[PDB]
Design a protein around this ligand. Structure first.
Ligand SMILES: [Fe+3]
Ligand SMILES: [Fe+3]
Lengths: 529, 529
């Protein structure tokens, strides 16, 4: 394992099976009682073989448990089929986002399988992206229907769950959204000659007669919207939800569907099948949550990609969408492990994300004429324009909310999910081209008074910040942020940073009693009460 | 069209239908009476679309006719099916090596054609590579069975010839070798679950019951050798021939056969389907020309690729093979038109070719022990080793003949084809990494002095040198070289350079009365007597 640099983060992690108390410096509030589960990649080499993409590493989950003003750390691999098969074969066996599976001599274009492959859907279950709450439990997810319930206290892998038993989808996001009733929404792709994006809701099994309090059984299709090009449907990482609407971008990142359906024979990864179609406008697709009907407006924007939406809400007949905008994501080669090991991913200017707002008029007034900015009468919409076109469509321009590049956006879900709001917290892990020292950004959506927490040295890397509210608080930022601080150097111990969300001033940190924590993805904080 | 640079060479050429006398400076020998036909790419744009690879341009043939101490120039497109379809087009209609045609909406994996595609074979007849003599005529060839007879005087496209009507191959080289009897040898690939390399002879249609004196009908399989990996057979550009043997390299450039067979659905070019398998040794495959039996020796080398073999001959029970060795050819992306337009192709150090010799022992003595260099008692084999292996195989190492990078090798075919010899003439068109000005190289295979003719300015590009013998001569180099000098500048007229082969000193040049001649490939000189 290398002493310093990003290669250090790509050596295999080992289980930390027993929770270890972490060295605390500072103080935490009385309401910091709960458990944060973090998902991400942890196994990058198997024997002499190496995974290719950041998204590929086998899921290695961590538990950050807060109790009596202390923090306890543990970590374990997810016991997926992908993991078990690879550990038992000491070879890369299961396909992942960007690494080939072992070639099967019985699956060639000259074998009988070539006559059966359309009947088959190969299970991809490296659920290393995030955790999704369903009733009383958390499920580890990736961008497939194949999930695992995970024990909050022990990180034990419990039973598998197959989303596609309830709705016919081939892929789906690992970023399901949920509301105050605990109902869980997703969008998935059903591939075919008329590929469609399928919008789903899963009712909270606790609020209804169910087989158990963590069941997915109450899952149904809300509606669906066809891909513009059925053979090149958009890739999708996340989507947005307001009180009444679900919204997605038809991005320039497209899946080459015929190549993916044949990928076993042409020996292509899912990653190989992504293409950047810069010659096409982005479209906004909006579905009514109650009727399942698509909003009848054509909504076009200049090309861009977003991994993550922030919050989404309705105001004055408009749909407000915040998201982290990337000018040209390509096909995500920037996040190949070879390009991250050098650190050069951080300086790919066209790939860096910036928090961005777009404002969609949900109706066009009868007095409006082509060329009119339909937002001109919306005072709070300054910096966005949504211009009526000659053909009745609308062209939307965005406002960059913050000049500091940021991603992994989070907000005060308990108070203002699906409502007008002021703050987005994010991380600068993707990089920066202006030399800024920022690690965590608190972006101000109303007055532009942004706050930052700076990385203390070049070996610190900020993870996704999680907002935990003060139960006795009233303002949107009355709470703390939990921020995992990863380390790319043996000179820097990893730690969990606790910030006052109002000021981004540190109140405590907890040093991890291990040399490394993963260059990970998303985390979920479950309060004890 | 730009005033200067390689982009000049990638604008479409226009027909020059009538021979134009060229401005002569200097003097030529009395025996320079004959016709040189040159093949190469000339049409690179169709409407606003552009072909992608150097190998793609539709064939544009030139005639350089030497007579009465004069040279006459004319040029015309080859009237293939591809050309005929394309002039009547506005987008790329005929697919080539590295460019797709427009997609057929009825040929998706969801259509009935997906059940029929293995029965269908699309004709690729852009015969733009070289000319091959068969009886009394010349045939324009590419790396497919589809050829055209071409009139020596008018460049008129005559009748098509389909090699696959006489032997079952899917592809074959455009670098057929021939002997003093006018027999024509090739190697072609028959793809399938046990892909094989098929070795062929075409008996001179003269001296035999034939439909005419240029017929391919007397074509038979000499034998065949299976690919080591039937789904990854080697790409092949050329091969070698001695008095009694045919020899080919199983190179690291491999065809991804499954991807190629499915290329209509995954929208891949043949070029896209080439891959560099750097982790594999090169194998030498040798076939006896008379008996069709494969040499029962296993012969391995460190990876490399060669476009062009030079001469090949037997001596003292060994098989001597000369060829232009490239360390890492990748999948030929260096020769994409985008990378040639910038001139940067000339400085890809691992892609540059170097004339090279390897020496194959055709038997292993009973006294030989593993670890023995089987060439140790062969005095002239210095710098080469063929070391017997523990498993009975032979591992061969090569000798770099000349330190100046060179390709398009030619030799004094009339005197020493298939015999021991001294000289290879070549061009530096592929580039150089040391800034040298060399244009034409005369390499000495007997450890002698290599001679060079230097380009006069950076806008001169040397084509393939052809050796024309002095009939009164005795020495191997008693003759002249004909060298097309292409121009990348409106300040430089293209011309044909006539060099004394003994000294590589110019005796004459003929200025072409056109602004450009193509960045072309191979040429054939047919003497008038
Ligand atoms: Fe994500
Ligand atoms: Fe060639």
């Amino acid at each position: 394992m290398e002493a310093e640099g990003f290669p250090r983060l790509f050596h295999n992690f080992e289980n930390v099976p027993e929770p270890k108390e972490c060295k605390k410096v500072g103080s935490v509030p009385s309401y910091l009682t709960g458990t944060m589960l973090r998902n991400g990649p942890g196994m990058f080499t198997v024997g002499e073989e190496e995974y290719k993409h950041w998204f590929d590493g086998l899921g290695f989950m961590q538990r950050y448990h807060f109790e009596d003003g202390k923090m306890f750390y543990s970590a374990r691999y997810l016991e997926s089929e992908a993991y078990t098969k690879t550990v038992e074969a000491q070879r890369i066996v299961a396909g992942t986002f960007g690494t080939l599976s072992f070639p099967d001599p019985c699956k060639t274009i000259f074998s009988k399988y070539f006559s059966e492959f359309m009947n088959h859907s190969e299970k991809h279950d490296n659920s290393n992206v995030a955790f999704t709450p369903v009733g009383d439990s958390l499920y580890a997810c990736t961008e497939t229907p194949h999930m695992y319930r995970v024990d909050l206290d022990t990180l034990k892998t419990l039973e598998a769950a197959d989303f596609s038993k309830f709705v016919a989808v081939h892929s789906c996001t690992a970023h399901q959204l949920y509301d105050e009733n605990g109902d869980v929404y997703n969008i998935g792709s059903r591939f075919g000659p008329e590929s469609a994006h399928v919008f789903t809701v899963t009712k909270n099994p606790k609020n209804q007669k169910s087989e158990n309090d963590h069941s997915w059984e109450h899952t149904s299709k809300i509606g669906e919207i066809k891909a513009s090009d059925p053979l090149y449907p958009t890739y999708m990482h996340s989507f947005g939800m307001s009180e009444n609407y679900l919204v997605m971008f038809e991005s320039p990142v497209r899946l080459h569907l015929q190549k993916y359906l044949l990928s076993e024979f042409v020996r292509a990864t899912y990653h190989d099948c992504l293409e950047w179609h810069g010659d096409k406008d982005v479209s906004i697709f909006i579905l009514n949550k109650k009727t399942g009907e698509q909003l009848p407006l054509t909504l076009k924007m200049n090309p861009f990609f977003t991994f993550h939406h922030a919050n989404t809400f309705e105001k004055d007949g408009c749909l407000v969408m915040d998201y982290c905008r990337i000018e040209n994501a390509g096909k995500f080669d920037t996040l190949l492990i070879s390009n991250m090991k050098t650190g050069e991913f951080q300086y790919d200017a066209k790939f860096l994300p910036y928090l961005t707002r777009v404002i969609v008029p949900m109706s066009v007034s009868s007095s409006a004429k082509p060329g009119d900015n339909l937002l001109k009468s919306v005072p709070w919409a300054s910096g966005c324009t949504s211009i009526l076109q000659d053909d009745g469509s609308i062209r939307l321009t965005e406002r960059r909310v913050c000049e500091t590049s940021m991603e992994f956006p989070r907000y005060h879900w308990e108070k203002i999910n699906m409502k007008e709001y002021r703050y987005v917290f994010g991380s600068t892990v993707f990089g920066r081209i202006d030399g800024n020292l920022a690690g965590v950004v608190k972006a101000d959506l109303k007055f532009g008074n942004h706050l930052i927490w700076n990385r203390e040295n070049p070996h610190q890397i900020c993870g996704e910040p999680i907002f935990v509210p003060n139960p006795e608080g009233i303002e949107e930022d009355d709470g703390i942020l939990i921020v995992p601080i990863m380390s790319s150097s043996e000179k820097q111990v990893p730690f969990v940073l606790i910030l006052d969300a109002k000021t981004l001033e540190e109140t405590a940190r907890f040093e991890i009693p291990e040399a490394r924590i993963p260059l990970g993805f998303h985390a979920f904080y479950k309060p004890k009460n």
